[PDB]
Design a protein around this ligand. Structure first.
Ligand SMILES: *SC[C@H](NC(=O)CC[C@H](N)C(=O)O)C(=O)NCC(=O)NCCCNCCCCN
Length: 144
């Protein structure tokens, strides 16, 4: 996996209440790293739009979303991630969050960066705006 250079400290990611998801289940997909936090109103307001997009398109367009949390506390993470249907980098992997923030040049939230799982190549850094501008995914994955 292609993405293994982006997970130095977590071998499993979250889905719902579990922590049994491994990286091979992302083979062949585009993976969107979603930088967000509940303390940020703009981020909170973008999340539902991304939820509708995910329900409409995740299967047909073969993508996954992974929350990379800038939340303030373990409790805030738990409550905010519980609103989401997709994956998350575990909160206790703070170092891994900082690694990805630096690696994808994330200076603000919400930010959504799409990567090809098999190569690890960044495909798009504009997915936040394009989920809003292209809600039917006509031009997905919006390659930069
Ligand atoms: S809620 C957190 C904030 N996000 C926004 O305000 C939303 C931005 C935009 N309208 C959008 O909707 O995407 C956020 O992520 N703030 C963090 C941040 O931007 N810090 C970077 C500050 C860098 N300042 C540079 C100063 C250099 C001067 N020489």
């Amino acid at each position: 996996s292609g993405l293994k250079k982006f997970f130095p400290y977590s071998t499993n990611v979250l889905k719902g209440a579990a922590a049994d998801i491994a990286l091979p289940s992302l083979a062949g997909k585009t993976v969107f790293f979603y930088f967000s936090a509940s303390w940020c109103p703009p981020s909170r307001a973008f999340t539902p739009q991304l939820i509708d997009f995910y329900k409409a398109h995740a299967e047909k367009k073969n993508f996954e979303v992974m929350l990379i949390s800038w939340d303030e506390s373990a409790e805030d993470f738990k409550d905010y991630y519980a609103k989401m249907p997709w994956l998350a980098l575990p909160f206790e992997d703070r170092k891994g969050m900082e690694f990805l923030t630096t690696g994808f040049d994330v200076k603000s939230i919400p930010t959504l960066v799409g990567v090809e799982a098999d190569s690890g190549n960044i495909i798009t850094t504009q997915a936040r705006t394009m989920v809003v501008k292209d809600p039917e995914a006509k031009d997905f994955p919006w390659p930069n």
